[PDB]
Amino acid sequence: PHMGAYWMSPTADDIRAMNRMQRQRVVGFTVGRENVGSVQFKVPVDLSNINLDDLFGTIVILEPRSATVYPNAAKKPPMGKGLNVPALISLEHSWPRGGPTIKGRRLERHIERLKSIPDTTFESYDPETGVWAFSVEHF
Secondary structure, three states: OOOOOEEEEOOHHHHHHOOHHHHOOEOOOEEEEOOOEEEEEOOOEOOOOOOOOOOEOOOEEEEOOEEEEOOOHHHOOOOOOOOOOOEEEEEOOOOOOOOOOOOHHHHHHHHHHHHOOOOOEEEEEEOOOOEEEEEEOOO
């Protein structure tokens, strides 16, 4: 696999510089990984109890075509708490089998399948870049 660095927005520096009130309600918090995709939380999140330097690969795991938040059910907070909130997920490399030149009906059936994935709400598929974007309500 060919993956680059994890990142977050606002940055860990920005969040470390917030006061307690601000860090309890971080808007548009996004965790991504170069050449994989990103997870953007759709409601404000409380990061006061999250270690920003033990987040990538521990709480949020981004692998090719796969995003995971809280892989260990025993340590997963209740729905609506921590990062267990609705999120917009964008995944690169989501092409039809055959790759970027597959168009027409074969591409349409691929989009149909992505629109139907259980527990997701389809947002978009970009046929030129291979990005599938969709929302989930909990992890």
